[PDB]
From Swiss-Prot, chains A, B, C:
Recorded GO MF terms: chemoattractant activity; cytokine activity; cytokine receptor binding; dopachrome isomerase activity; identical protein binding; phenylpyruvate tautomerase activity; protease binding
Subunit structure: Homotrimer. Interacts with CXCR2 extracellular domain. Interacts with the CD74 extracellular domain, USO1, COPS5 and BNIPL.
Post-translational modification N6-succinyllysine, affected residues: K77
One CC-aspect GO term: cytosol
Protein name in the entry: Macrophage migration inhibitory factor
Major localisation: secreted
Record lineage: Eukaryota, Metazoa, Chordata, Craniata, Vertebrata
Function of the protein: Pro-inflammatory cytokine involved in the innate immune response to bacterial pathogens. The expression of MIF at sites of inflammation suggests a role as mediator in regulating the function of macrophages in host defense. Counteracts the anti-inflammatory activity of glucocorticoids. Has phenylpyruvate tautomerase and dopachrome tautomerase activity (in vitro), but the physiological substrate is not known. It is not clear whether the tautomerase activity has any physiological relevance, and whether it is important for cytokine activity.
Similarity field: Belongs to the MIF family.
Record's catalysed reaction(s): 3-phenylpyruvate = enol-phenylpyruvate; L-dopachrome = 5,6-dihydroxyindole-2-carboxylate
Binding-site positions, substrate: K32, I64, N97
Length: 114, 114, 114
């Protein structure tokens, strides 16, 4: 699975080890080995939520399987909690797009996961 | 709805109030409450369109519904117009990917829209 | 077709002519004219793959058609080949999400490709 976070929160406001924490937390949440987890944090972004420039975040979680109604509700609770605690972003100013990818549409190591 | 614009146009060329204008126009165009509109602009990017480094833009518009043949054409007319007028980018050097998201695949406020 | 690569490799490590090479190779690979190919490279990113901060890349290839099991495997060999040779990124530290887009869902030149 791969998780990306785009936020207007300053770089200096991103705690050391945040990437490591995301990796471990996602490994547990998805049940996938951490070796397969990819995390990407993009701070200092020019963005707005509801017209406001208050702290916010636009995220995405791509996974081959492990995506569904209940699971996504669970991932959101987890991720919003992490963003609220580590970056001080209000959960109601966070959007997380979930993508259930087909193995044939994910390239890796010169081939695909098909 | 969430709109993202990646462009090689410099930061200084993005006019004040641009994010604000995008939010309103999208609110109007989508028929969605302004408070739920998210906008993200990423200037100074290393990109090419048709092999050329002249001003260009790669964008995305995600929305739960309100995505379709006629609606997308209307959004494109609107958004290319804004990019041409505000960022001086030719409409024929702009790509906009539209995504009709399922409510269950959009996280927000510790849960999802399902 | 549009290709985006996000990587923690530094900007100085991206060789001159990289965007042009991607443009040409993707035109050759997809069979589409180079005039339609868009490429975007984002270096110096804050990311981890498998819990490690060694060179890695998170990419996406969007295309109207020309996406499939065998074609995607071919694109992955080509793109990982380029990332390894030009950016010194190990193929097993690269993810490429492939998206087969409907023409009606791709905006360009004030309208869509429908
Ligand atoms: O392991 N995860 C692999 C993976 C799953 C889904 C993606 O979009 C990219 C990469
Ligand atoms: C044909 O040219 N490619 C168009 C195109 C295809 C897919 C996209 O996501 C954006 C633009």
């Amino acid at each position: 699975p791969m998780f990306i976070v785009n936020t207007n929160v300053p770089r200096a406001s991103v705690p050391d080890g945040f990437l490591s924490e995301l990796t471990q937390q996602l490994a547990q949440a998805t049940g996938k080995p951490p070796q397969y987890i990819a995390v990407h944090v993009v701070p200092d972004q020019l963005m707005a939520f509801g017209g406001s420039s208050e702290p916010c975040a636009l995220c995405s979680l791509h996974s081959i399987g492990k995506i569904g109604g209940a699971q996504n509700r669970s991932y959101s609770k987890l991720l919003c909690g992490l963003l609220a605690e580590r970056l001080r972003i209000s959960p109601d100013r966070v959007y997380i797009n979930y993508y259930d990818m087909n193995a044939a549409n994910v390239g890796w190591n010169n081939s695909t996961f098909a």
